[PDB]
Amino acid sequence: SFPVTMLPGDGVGPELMHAVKEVFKAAAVPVEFQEHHLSEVQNMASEEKLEQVLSSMKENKVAIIGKIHTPMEYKGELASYDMRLRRKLDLFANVVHVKSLPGYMTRHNNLDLVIIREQTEGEYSSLEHESARGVIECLKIVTRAKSQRIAKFAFDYATKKGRGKVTAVHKANIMKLGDGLFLQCCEEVAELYPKIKFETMIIDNCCMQLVQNPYQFDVLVMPNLYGNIIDNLAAGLVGGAGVVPGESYSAEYAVFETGARHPFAQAVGRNIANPTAMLLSASNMLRHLNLEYHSSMIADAVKKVIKVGKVRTSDMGGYATCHDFTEEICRRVKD
Amino acid sequence: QTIPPSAKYGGRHTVTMIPGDGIGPELMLHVKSVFRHACVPVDFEEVHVSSNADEEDIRNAIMAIRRNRVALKGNIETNHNLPPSHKSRNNILRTSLDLYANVIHCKSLPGVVTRHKDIDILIVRENTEGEYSSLEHESVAGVVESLKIITKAKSLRIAEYAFKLAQESGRKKVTAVHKANIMKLGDGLFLQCCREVAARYPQITFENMIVDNTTMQLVSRPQQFDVMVMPNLYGNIVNNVCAGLVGGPGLVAGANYGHVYAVFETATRNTGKSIANKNIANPTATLLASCMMLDHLKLHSYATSIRKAVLASMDNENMHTPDIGGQGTTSEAIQDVIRHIRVINRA
Amino acid sequence: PPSAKYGGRHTVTMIPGDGIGPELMLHVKSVFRHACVPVDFEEVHVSSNADEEDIRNAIMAIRRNRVALKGNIESHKSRNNILRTSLDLYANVIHCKSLPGVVTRHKDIDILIVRENTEGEYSSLEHESVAGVVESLKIITKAKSLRIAEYAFKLAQESGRKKVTAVHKANIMKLGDGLFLQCCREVAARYPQITFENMIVDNTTMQLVSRPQQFDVMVMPNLYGNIVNNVCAGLVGGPGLVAGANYGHVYAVFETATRNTGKSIANKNIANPTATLLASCMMLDHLKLHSYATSIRKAVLASMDNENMHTPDIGGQGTTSEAIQDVIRHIRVINGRAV
Incomplete structure (x- = not known):
């Protein structure tokens, strides 16, 4: 079998995974989970065991996590861990599919986009100090390396998945040399993939158009701050945090x-x-684990039960327990 | 320039792939299917190549190759030559890529019986300085001069490649091919070009041989050869001949290397325009091209499990293609290799 | 192109600039003339008149010859700064040496100071966060620190020196200097035959006025320069003595220690040429013409053993037309070479 590390994270994190456990244990997926419990999110004060999570990660080469919810004004620096972790696994690229699902009927439908978000640079690097009493100064950082690379990942995904155009989001009309530098690295790469048209949209003007006609976009690449912004805006359109899946690759x-x-x-x-x-x-994880059988079954199993609609949870216009919904995933995957 | 680093995002190396004309596409899809069954972490960047619009677009098609340092291609029909100005679609790419070394691997196949058996030969040759001269001006009518060119520099670069090939692979003999007995200076330059590097690898025995006797020596006792090297002019001879010894053009993997860039091509440059979508074409060469393409990505574990397969499927008589004397169709072969291809390491 | 090297006498970019260089350059022209030096000159114009692109054409001349020798000149930036960026010159050297011809307060001095030019930075920018509050940013790059640490150790093995010292303030800035200290520490393990030392800049300055003999080679970030530089300049006597130089990965430009024009002492035939000559001395040392440099070097220091060949900026009464023609005598010339 294949062993993959599982970081439950905080919140419903563990309650999620235990459903993916029952789903997996119901489709005979050959995966033991070396649970590296509790990446600290103040549930357990834990820190600099990231290398211990990396160590199983230098082994199994792939993992799925919950959410390392991040604490506020605690932990002294409260340097965001995920990123901290992210820095550790060098997870520069964070990709979030936004796929409207057959059953869910929102205020937008049949929408298919993909969000591409850098995770190291930007403001997420906790660079703050006091210039004088109540005068706080905070850094915004963009590396033309870590920006060229996320632009590099940006188009190679567009070609690999056959997408039309990527559109780079920015606010360089303010930070003329910050996003301006990042904006240049994209055009320097956008000229390299000439099969793919390429736009540059001012950040807000995107978020506006995204509520009016997000159908105009295809692929979106941006730094971390605009990322974490657009990520949550987009998922609300498709259905919310209950359905929207996410992947974050690295070098390996x-x-x-x-x-x-x-x-x-x-x-x-x-x-x-x-x-x-x-x-x-x-399932998008099994589709990376070359078990394209199990992944393509699980998705259909999930995608169907949604389009059925007889069973939905609070977030989806229905009232039904997790295990109620989880069993019906398991039931509709046994026959 | 503006060139970035070719990178491998989280597993899958991203390799450029070109379908081509004729047999090219109908084979590539099996190579995809072979990989996809073998769970090979190699994603493929298709690029429509040529004979549809060979003017400026292909060029946007060069770029994908300049990106990922490794590509696999089929073949492109030759230009009509109406332009009649160089413009070898295949050639242009190897020019703007500085692809100097051309390498083929004629090996015997236990399932393909030939006049001779137990053959293993690696052929090496240049492209822009290994003679094969163009030019050819008409001094006055009825008189034409051709100008074969040797460059001492590219002669040593292809020489060092011949020996850097032998040591990493555990070979034992490099044998130069030349006609220094007729062009004392041109091929003697190349000869002394070989002698210089030959002393830097003393463990590797070195030998020269005239192109004439070398051809004779192949059809009689080709097993004596281990590594052969010549300028690009004599290659067409040695290549097509060593090709036919172990079988035919549809059994020889090929490769054009650059100082950094590496392209994989079939041993025999046959368009197959006459066997279009016949489910007939021999895949065993094209497959073998993917084998050494994996060996160049340092993934031998998969190139080795693929290689043992294609030898495996070929040994049953029924799988041979018409071009080598069989009665089967590609779809049976590809699947029979897939049959032969067990789930090593998956489900 | 390639560095031009026509067979026979080599070609060097020559530019007098503002200040006494034009008067100085012709006297160094006379020094190279008398010493039969097979070194020509291609003089190039400079700033305060032909602003912007006109200087660039002259740099384009310096783009040819990998070596030049210059006087001093003078929002935006300075010409010397704009030149060393346009040539990526990242190794500013000065040679502070005691002179048997002028007794200072201390004797027995031989010191080479090398700093960076963009690495020290500290001129990067500044923001008025609020009224009356300013952020200035020290910039320590690991690469350029190593690269200037390598230039220090390589030059020391070339000039036979024994000791190389790291001047820092990592006790207060634990990271910027603490990066530069360990940056030199990695280099020092690769040159074990050379003793490596660190020192707070404070205790270093206190040691200069008390025991400068314990200092062979001093390497530091470019900020601390003006302090240590202009101190070791006045320690051997001041500006007109110490010879300066700005190197690069391929290019190498020589100049005086202090960039002062001395526009007050203009055409008075008064200014000390000592440093401007010593700049040509180690500039010939760069061209490996050590024979021609070892002559001019000992010739001026023995000609300075006289008190009537000093200049007013060091205490004497003599003029330049004297000591220049006087060193012309002390250059022993036999059959067209320096013997």
């Missing part, structure tokens, strides 16, 4: 997580959380 390692942060409300293991986002990411 590849990670699968929920798309958005999490349902803000503290459902907290009342078995009212939706496992869809995990499962889709989880």
Whole structure:
């Protein structure tokens, strides 16, 4: 069998995975999970065991995590861990599919995009100090390396998945040399993939168009701050954090997580959380593990039960338990 | 320039792939299918290549190759030559890529019986300085001069490649091919070009041989040869002959290397325009091209499990293609190799 | 192109600039003339008149010859700064040496100071975060630190020196200097036959006025320069003595230590040529013409053993037309070479 590390994270994190456990244990997927429990999110004060999580990660080459929810003004520096972790696994690229699903009927439909987000640079590098009493100065960082590389990943995904045009989001009309530098690295690469048209949209003007006509876009590449922004805006369109899956690759390692942060409300293991986002990411994980059988079954199993609609959870216009929904995934995958 | 690093995002190396004209596409899809069954972490960047619009677009098609340092291609029909100005579609690519070394691998096949058996030969030759001269001006009518060119520099670069090939692969004899007995200076220059590097690898025995007797020596006792090297002019001879010894053009993997860039091509440059979509073409060469393409990505584990397969499927008599004397169709072969291809290491 | 090297006398970019260089360059022209030096000159114009692109054409001349010798000149930036960026000159050297001809307060001095030029930075920018509050940024690159640390150790093995010292303030800036200290520490393990030393800049300055003999080679970030530089300049006597040089990965430009024009002492035939000559001395040392340099070197220092050949900036009464023609005498010339 194949062993993949599982980081439950905080919130419904563990309650999600235990459904992916029952799903997997119901489709005979040959995967033992060397659970590297509790990446600390203040559930357990834990830190600099990232190398211990990397160590199983230097082995199994792939993992799926929950969400390392991040704490506020605690942990002293509260240097964001994921990124901290992210820095460790060099997970510069974070890719979140936004695929409207057959059953879910939102205010937007049949929409298919893909969000591409850098994870090392940007403001997420905790570079802050006091210039004087109540005068706080915070850094925005862009590396033309880590920007050229995310632009490099940006188009090579467009060609590999056959997409039309990528559109780079920015605010360089303000930070003329910051996003301006990043904007240049994209055109320097956009000229290299001439089969793919390429736009540059001012950040806000995107987020506006995304509520009016997000159908105009295809692939979106941006730094981290605009990323974490667009990621949550987009998932709300398709359905919310309960369905939207996410992947974050690296040089060799590849990670699968929920798309958005999490349902803000503290459902907290009342078995009212939706496992869809995990499962889709989880099947998109088997589709990377060359078990293209199991992945292409699980998705259909999940995609069907949604389009059925007889069973939905709080986030999807219905009321039904997680295990209620999870069994029906398991039931509709046994026959 | 503006060139970036070719990178491998989280597993799958991204390799450029060109379908071509004639047999090219109908084979590539099996190579895809072979890989996809073998769970090979290699993604493929298709690029429509030529005979549809060989003017400026292909060029946007060069770029994909200049990106990923490794590509695999089929063949392109020759230009009509109406332009009659160089413009070898295949050639242009190897020019703007500085692809100097051309390498083929004629090996005997236990399932392909030939006049001779137990053959293993690696052939090496240049492209822009290994003679094969163009030019050819008419001084006055009825008189034409051709100007074969040797460059001492590219002669040593192809020489060092011949020996850097032998040591990494555990070979034992490099044998130069030349006609220094007739063009004392041109081929003697290449000869002394070989002698210089030959002393830098003393463990590797070195030998020269005249192109004439070398051809004779092939059809009689070709097993004596291990590594052969010549300028590009004499290659067409040695290549097509060593090709036919172990079988035919559809059994020889090929490769054009650059100082950094590496392209994989079939041993025999046959368009097959007459066997279009006949489900007939011999895949065993094209497959073997993917084999050494994996060996160049340092993934031998898969190139080795693929290689043992294609030898495996070929040994049953029924799988041979018409071009080598069989009665089967490609679809049976590809699947029979896929049959032969077990789930090593998956489900 | 290639560095031009027509067989016979080599070609060097020559530019007098503002200040006494034009008066100086012709006297160094007379020094190279008398010493039968097979070195020609291609003089190039400079700033404060032909602003912007006109200087670039002259740089394009310096783009040819990998070596030049210059005087001093002078929002935006300076011409000397714009030149060393346009040539990526990242090794500014000065040779502070005691002179038997002028007794200072201390004797027995031989010191080579090398700093960077973009690495020290500190001129990068600044922002008025609020009224009255400014952020200035020290910039320490690991690469350029190593690269200037290598230039220090390689030059020391070339000039036979024994000791190389790291001047820093990592005790207060634990990271910027603490990166530069360990940056030199990696290099020092690769030159074990050379003793390596670190020192706070404070205790280093206190040692200069008390025991400069314990200093062979001093390497530091370019910020600390003006302090250590202009101190070791006045330690051997001041500006008109110490010879300067700006090297690069291929290019190498020589100049005086202090960039002062001395526009007050203009055409008075008063200014000390000592440093401007010593700049040609180690500039010939770069062209490996050590024979021609070892002559001019000992010739001026023995000609300076006289008190009437000093200049007012060091205490004497003599003019330049004297000591110049006087060193012309002390250059022993037999059959067209320096013997």
